[PDB]
Each structure stands twice: as structure tokens, then as C-alpha cells.
Enzyme design. Sequence first.
Site, PDB file in Angstrom:
ATOM      1  N   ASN A   5     -53.471  59.124 -16.992  1.00 29.75           N
ATOM      2  CA  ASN A   5     -53.124  60.362 -16.308  1.00 29.75           C
ATOM      3  C   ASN A   5     -53.122  60.105 -14.809  1.00 29.75           C
ATOM      4  O   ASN A   5     -54.158  59.749 -14.235  1.00 29.75           O
ATOM      5  CB  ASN A   5     -54.100  61.485 -16.665  1.00 29.75           C
ATOM      6  CG  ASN A   5     -53.651  62.832 -16.140  1.00 29.75           C
ATOM      7  OD1 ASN A   5     -52.493  63.009 -15.762  1.00 29.75           O
ATOM      8  ND2 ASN A   5     -54.564  63.796 -16.119  1.00 29.75           N
ATOM      9  N   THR A   6     -51.956  60.281 -14.184  1.00 27.88           N
ATOM     10  CA  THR A   6     -51.813  60.032 -12.755  1.00 27.88           C
ATOM     11  C   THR A   6     -52.391  61.158 -11.908  1.00 27.88           C
ATOM     12  O   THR A   6     -52.860  60.906 -10.793  1.00 27.88           O
ATOM     13  CB  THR A   6     -50.339  59.826 -12.399  1.00 27.88           C
ATOM     14  OG1 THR A   6     -49.656  61.084 -12.448  1.00 27.88           O
ATOM     15  CG2 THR A   6     -49.688  58.862 -13.379  1.00 27.88           C
ATOM     16  N   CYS A   7     -52.357  62.397 -12.406  1.00 25.48           N
ATOM     17  CA  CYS A   7     -52.894  63.514 -11.636  1.00 25.48           C
ATOM     18  C   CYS A   7     -54.386  63.352 -11.384  1.00 25.48           C
ATOM     19  O   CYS A   7     -54.893  63.800 -10.351  1.00 25.48           O
ATOM     20  CB  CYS A   7     -52.611  64.835 -12.354  1.00 25.48           C
ATOM     21  SG  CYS A   7     -53.760  65.227 -13.692  1.00 25.48           S
ATOM     22  N   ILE A   8     -55.102  62.719 -12.312  1.00 27.14           N
ATOM     23  CA  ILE A   8     -56.495  62.342 -12.115  1.00 27.14           C
ATOM     24  C   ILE A   8     -56.703  60.840 -12.185  1.00 27.14           C
ATOM     25  O   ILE A   8     -57.835  60.375 -12.015  1.00 27.14           O
ATOM     26  CB  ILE A   8     -57.423  63.057 -13.120  1.00 27.14           C
ATOM     27  CG1 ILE A   8     -57.168  62.549 -14.540  1.00 27.14           C
ATOM     28  CG2 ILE A   8     -57.245  64.565 -13.037  1.00 27.14           C
ATOM     29  CD1 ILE A   8     -58.144  63.089 -15.563  1.00 27.14           C
ATOM     30  N   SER A   9     -55.644  60.066 -12.437  1.00 24.64           N
ATOM     31  CA  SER A   9     -55.696  58.602 -12.442  1.00 24.64           C
ATOM     32  C   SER A   9     -56.787  58.079 -13.376  1.00 24.64           C
ATOM     33  O   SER A   9     -57.552  57.177 -13.032  1.00 24.64           O
ATOM     34  CB  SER A   9     -55.883  58.058 -11.023  1.00 24.64           C
ATOM     35  OG  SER A   9     -54.962  58.651 -10.124  1.00 24.64           O
TER      36      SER A   9
END
Lengths: 117, 701, 237
Positions: free
Chosen positions: B673-677
Amino acid sequence: LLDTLLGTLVKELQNKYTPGRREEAIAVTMRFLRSVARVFVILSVEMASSKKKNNFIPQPIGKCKRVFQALLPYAVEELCNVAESLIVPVRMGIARPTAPFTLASTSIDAMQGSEEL
Amino acid sequence: NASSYLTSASSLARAYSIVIRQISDLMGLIPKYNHLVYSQIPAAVKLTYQDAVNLQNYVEEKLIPTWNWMVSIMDSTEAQLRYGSALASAGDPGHPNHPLHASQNSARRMSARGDFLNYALSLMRSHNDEHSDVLPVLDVCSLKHVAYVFQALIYWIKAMNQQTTGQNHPFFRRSDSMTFLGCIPPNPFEVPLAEAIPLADQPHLLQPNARKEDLFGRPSQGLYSSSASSGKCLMEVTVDRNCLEVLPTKMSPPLTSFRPQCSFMGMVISHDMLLGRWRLSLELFGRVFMEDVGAEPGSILTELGGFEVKESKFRREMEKLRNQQSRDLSLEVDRDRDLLIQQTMRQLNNHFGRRCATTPMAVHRVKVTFKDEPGEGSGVARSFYTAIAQAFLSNEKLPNLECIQNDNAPLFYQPGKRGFYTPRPGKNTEARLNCFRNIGRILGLCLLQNELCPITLNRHVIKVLLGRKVNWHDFAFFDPVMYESLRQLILASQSSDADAVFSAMDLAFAIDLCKEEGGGQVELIPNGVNIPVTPQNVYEYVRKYAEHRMLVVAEQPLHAMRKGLLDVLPKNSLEDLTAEDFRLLVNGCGEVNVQMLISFTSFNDESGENAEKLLQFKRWFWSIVEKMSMTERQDLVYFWTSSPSLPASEEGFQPMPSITIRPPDDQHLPTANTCISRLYVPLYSSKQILKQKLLLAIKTK
Amino acid sequence: LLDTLLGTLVKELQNKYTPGRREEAIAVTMRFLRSVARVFVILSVEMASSKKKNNFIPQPIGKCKRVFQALLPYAVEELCNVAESLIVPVRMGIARPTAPFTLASTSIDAMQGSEELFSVEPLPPRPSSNGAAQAPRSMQWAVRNNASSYLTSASSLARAYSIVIRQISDLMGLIPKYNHLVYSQIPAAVKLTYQDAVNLQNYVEEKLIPTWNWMVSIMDSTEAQLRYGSALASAGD
């Protein structure tokens, strides 16, 4: 009030008519400047020089600076003596151990510590 | 509480520093006493010239003892540090006693009696200069009070001094970012580039924790007994405190024109020479004493601060500025590279629209959207930044931009070392100008948004962007080969056979530039073709050629990129920043370091297995990362945080990316997940399956 | 072996026919005496002077004392230099903090530590051709971090200085009876003259003046503080 005190000290320092008055004025100014230097150093140590808001001078520190600027030639000499007194134990290796303390981020905390002193 | 001696010593030294700062301010108020105090404050003391001079004499006499003490300690510690550095250069790194060894890390890992015996033997050996092949035993962390005293006295010297205040071409002179204060620069021609500017030879040396000596060469000093018998013009060699204490002690009218001059040692003292004389000590002081000794006003450790202080200040200022405007603006971005370029410049021009000129624009957040692809947040914005950087940095033709208001060759090329790019000008049409302005705009946006824009630039491009003055040594970052050729030509011009060699080479004031800039022959000066190159004006020819190859070819591109960056970032924050700092702040670290990943990494679990299996899986993952190559490294970092480059330091990553363990499964690929990496990895029961799944996951683009 | 070394040193010290021999012998003797002072100081610091059994002399300490007695006019100077080296950081307030350590009560346990400190190898040449963790890697050796206190280091260095000064005082007290006690019994001794003894005393006093002033200042200050406290207690409520 501080302006009145400094005015009296200066006016008596610049006195030639009354004999033996300049020396008394010198001694009185010396003692007063020593007291002001003591309180100034206590307040400055009790505080933290935060770069935020670029205040750099609370009201009491400003008063001490004004007093120093008034009687400048004697203020700098008394400051030199005070600094040498502060540094002699450090540079002789005889400092008395103390515990760490947190520096006050505001001025009311500084006032409380100074008042107990 | 702790009740330690060093705390009291440091506190008393801080009090002394406060008093000395007050004395310095008062002393500097004298030349304007009749204007700053006497006229304003109703009560003031008359001040003449003679009393001011006697006052300065009194202050110097009172400050002499502490000056001698600090000089002794600083000279001794600088001698110890310099001997340690010399021994490290001349020693064997494999030996445990070498300074540059893991055993000297002082954090990963003898008896107290042995330590004291080592300290005492070091002192006794150093008294008569018998300290060879053994590293000096000192603890700089215990010299905080000396640091405070040094800061106070340097403040005094600087305050009074400020109260007082090849061919010789400023182009060839090393700039402020080049040299060190108080130390002369190495000769640009005598030393080869492999040692004069090691950064150009190996660009990969730029790291958050970097010593300027390694990047920009090792400086020398014009000191020692040669034509010097003062006491401080003699270079510090002796280690023991007795000698460096004998040395500084055995040498024994309108008021507005005071001009105070500091002669503590019988000689005029400039703070720059003191900074040069105690370089290693000040570097260690800044790296160690910064939380406490770097906070007081007029801190030299702050002024001489490295990348850490500058980056923290810049990031805090960017956070303050981006939060001062409530206008939030975002973009719509798709993958298709031609469509990507068109939509990006159109939406950037719309972002510029509805406002005429003058004040720069500030945004709060960037919300990149994608057609037919879900996802929203900072992760999609970082993906957009990386994608647009890669698309702009592809060596292939570019789509037409005829609808900017409603030039074919790629914008950036590699002149020297691979990975570094500089603009190539075309027909200088308004479309390319607007595109360069847009690239400046999104570089600025990534600066404020705390996101790594990935357009790697050449270092003089960074200078022209930040507004500094280009020196010849920056040319060394252009391309080492022909820069070395120019240096060899300069050296040969000094030979007695210079005229014959110059005639044989038959060089004129013209440059044959290839198609990466437009091609053809360009005259350096009017009627320069008919003017040959002679050893009399070899310096002028080298200056003109070196500056011409990189500065004038692209006046319009770089000059437009200047407003491109300025239209978003106000000029207040570009100051106090160097090229290396900007490169590390925008581009991040060039190479992904395993240790850097280890520094900020946390692990979670969702499978519910025992702790032993989770620890074994974490060890396997770390071993994989260690045994895993650079291109695959950037692929994995993309798959993790939607970016190929890590930020400069721990702060800058928004979520502090973590890894979670899923229930075991041999048919499910790891996700992220890139929004939370956050990287979700299945608990693979076998090593080879884990390797295959990880490489397949990182292979996705 | 020590007797032979001292005999050769004395023989080359009292040689006049060979030109330039005496200065070289003096320099060699100075170097040897500095090394002997180092080993003696380390051994004494490692040990504790227990009053039980009144031994007062371990085997290596007696060897160092014999070396000092044999070359007294130079041994005293080298000991003075060693004492100054040990005492300067204490009286200049820069002592490196160290953890407390116990003192050896036996000569067979003091040999260790001294062995690991003296029997060491030099750094080989390069083959062919608190915020402490924030320090640069190349300077990591210059920064540290059971107690690690400044006061312990200061006290230990002062103890070493005390040992050296006691040895100096014993050596200078042996001067009046040099011929009866030192010269005749010891096979290798150095001839001593009255002017040499006077110069030696002047040198020792000149070397001891700074620490003397330091202690006098500190002690007068603290005595005045204590006397004022007692007077105020007598005059207080």
C-alpha cells in the site's frame, strides 16, 4: 522606576561640586551593577534561548540590558568579574556536581525559580 | 538526580558564555553609543575615547587566562584528532587498532582498570612526544564546557572583527561551497581530479553523513615555523597539554572612531584562521554538541553546520509555508506517456491560471487521480512524481505540445557520467520554454510537498537553479575526461615548449559542439576563428571554453527553469542551501543502502505463527535484501513506497514504511500500500518460493 | 641484567675522552628513565599499598627504585616530568571520565593488565598502496558512549601523581647519604656533587610550584568557607 534609579546614579556619578561624592557614587554603582548582574545571570540561565518567534528578550532581561547600557563602563567591568567568578571553578577542576534540569520554555516558570532564590 | 560533575561544568560554562555575549554586545555598542543609548535612554554615562581604550585593555587582560586555557585544550585535542586521521591514512584497516574499524564504533561494543591504564599511558607517552603507532585516548564528548567557552570567545572575536569591518580570475577561484574557512584551497591544476574533487570521480559519495574533506578534497594550511615565530602561526603538532600551555604563555579623537581590534596573543586574530586551525575539533563539536551547544545565539556550530541542520531547517520552513495557505490543488494523471505529458502541462498551466504574476503559489496537498485505476493519497502523488520524472528522462522523441497555448529532441542528456542530466536547447520555441517552466514547477512542488522528485540534474544546473556563481571546479562534475584534458593542457602551457605545442595543435577561439546541443562550430569571441590559441592567453581560452560548454549553450533553458522553481518557492528559503544539499533533498540518496533500510524498519504479523518462524522469516528477508542488486533494489523500493529513491534522512518518509506477515500461502504474491507504504508479505514455508515470489513482485512496474 | 644495563649507562655517562659521547649517553638515559617511570607508575597505580605485613616493596617496584637510585640526578627529573604529565589534566579540568576499578592486592594479579597494556604491537602499515553516535565514522574513536565519572578519573590521576611525588621525595632524601647507602652497595651508581644536588632541588621546586599553587588556592578557599560556616553557626539562630 528603573529609569529613575539609573538617573540618580548617573547624576551623582557626574558630580564635581560636592567633594568626595564621585567615589561614593562609584562604589554605589558598583554594588548595584553587581546585584543586577547576579539577577540577570540567574534569569538567563533559568531560561532557554529558543529561536522561535525571535523574541530574544523577555521583559526582565530587557531591563537588565538597559541597566547595563546605562552605566556601560562599569557594567562591563562588573560583568567581566562575574564571568571570571563563574568560570574559575570550571577551569580549575573544582566544580561542585549538580543534577540536570530542564530549561523553561516560557517566562512565568523562570519567575517562579528566581523568586525562590 | 544524576549529580554529575560534567553537568555543573557545562552549566557554569553556559553562564560564562551568556556573560561574555553580553560583554561583546556592550563593547560593540560603544562606537554608536551616542546614537543608540545616550540619545534614546534618558539616563546615560558620558563615554570618551581614552576610557574606551582602557576598557578594552581591561577586558583583554581579564579574558587572557581563559583564552590561554581554551587555546591549550583546543590545540591539544586538534593535534590528537589530526594524528588519529594521519594514522588512519597510514594504517591497516584490518587491524583492530585502526580508527576506521568496527571495534571503534563505540556503540556496537575493556575493563575499567585497563581503560584508565590506557588513558594514563597515553598521557605519559604524549608528554614527551612518544605517541607513535598507538591511537590517542581522548573523549571529546566530555569537553562540553570547553566548547561553550570556545563559542563565547569566538563570538567575542567575531563581534569585534565585524565591528572593524593560474591567472587570478574569480571564475577559477574556489567558491564558498568549495573551500573551508581559514584554509587555502588546493591548486586546481597541480592535483588530479581523482584527489582534488573526489565527488566528481565517484558521484555516489553524497550521503547525509558525509565529511566535506572526502567530497571536496583534503585542505592544507600555511602554518608552522617557516616564517612564523608568533605562537599561533606555528602549526599544532604536540599532543600533551603542558606544551600547548607553555606555548601561549611563554610568548609574553571622536568616540565614533573607536575601531576595536583584538590582540589577545600580541597578534591580530581573525576568527577564520581559528576555525581553520581547529577544523577537526569543530567538526566533532558540531556533530556531537548540537542539541545543547548549538542552540545559543550566534552559534558557530550552527553557521558551520552540515547537511543535517540545513535540511531540518528547510523541511520545517517548508512545512510552515505549505500550511500557511488553504488553497489545495491537485492533478489528473494517466500512464500514457504522450497523453501524460500533454495532460500534465495543461493542468500545470491551469494551476498557473487565474493568477497574473508576482507572488508565488502555495499548495497544501497533491491528490493525483488516475483514469481506470483506483487509489488516492500521498502514495499516488509519489507514483506520479516518479512516473513523470522517468517519462521526462527517457532518451527518445517527445510528443508535440501545440495545445499549450490552446523542438523534438529529448530535453535532458548525459554529458559526462551516466545518471546526471543537463538541458539541451532546441529551437527555443515557447512550447519548450513552458515545458521547462513546468519542470521547474514540479521540482518546486516536490520540494514543498516533501516528496522526492527524481529528475537527476548536473551540479551546475543546480547552481543556476539556486542562483550561485559557477566556478571552474564545478566543470569537473560535467565530465572528468575532457576536464582532465583541459587541466593537462594548462599544465603543459607552463612548460618551456608551450608555444611549439600550441602551434602544433593549431587551436583557435572556436568550439566544435556536437548534436547533443545543436552541433557546428561556434565562435567564443567575435572573429575568434582567425584568432589562434596561444600560451599567453591559455587561461582565457580555458575559461571561455569551459564556461561556454555548459553555461551559454543553454541560457534560455536554465534561465526559464529559474522562474519555474521561483514561481512556487519564495527566494527566502533557497539561501543557506548548497548544490549537494539540494541534490540530497530532492533526489535522495543515489544508491539504496541496506543499513539505511535497517535504520527505519518495523515488522508486524498477521499469520499468528510462533515468534521463531517470524524471526526466521525476517532474517531471510534481510538476507534477500543483502544479496540483491541495485536495479532490483530500486525496483523493490518502488514496489514498497512507490518511489525509487529514499529521502535524505529518517524524517521525510511520511509513514515510516513497515512490513506485515500474512497467513502462509504458496500461490499469493506479496502486496503493498503506497498511501501508507506498508508491505504485506505471505509467510512462505520454503526459501526458493520466497525468493521467486519476491523477485516477481519487485519485477512489476 | 639490570645491573649490566646500569653499569654500561654509567660508564658511558662518565666518559670524557670520546667527543660527543656524554650527550648521547644523557639522551639515551633520559629515554630509558622515561620508560622505567611509565612502567613504575602503571604498576603502582594497579596496586594498593596494604599496610599488612609491611612488604612496602614488590619485586618489580624494587627494580624500578634501584634504577632510579642508580641514575638519581636524571631519574628525579624524569619522575618530575611524569608527575606533571599525570597531574596536568586534573588541575586543568579536562580529565576523561572513567569507570571505577578495584586495586590489585597481589603481585601475581597486577602482572596482568600491565602485560596487556605493555606487551602490545604497533599499528602495521597499509598493505601495498550525549550525541556520541552522531559523530562521523572517521572520528568515532574520539567519542565514547559502570559509572564513567569525571571524579573517579581525577582521583586516580591524583593518586598516580602522589605515588610519583612520594618516590621523588624518597630519592631526594637519599641524597645526603648517597655514598654510604647508594654508591657503595649498588655496583652501578652515578657520582653526585653538592652543586648537582642544589641544582636538583631547585629543579624539583620549580617543577612542583604550579601544583603547589593550585592546592594552596583550593585549600585556602575551602578552609575559609568552612571557617565562615562555623562562625555563622556560632552567631546564628
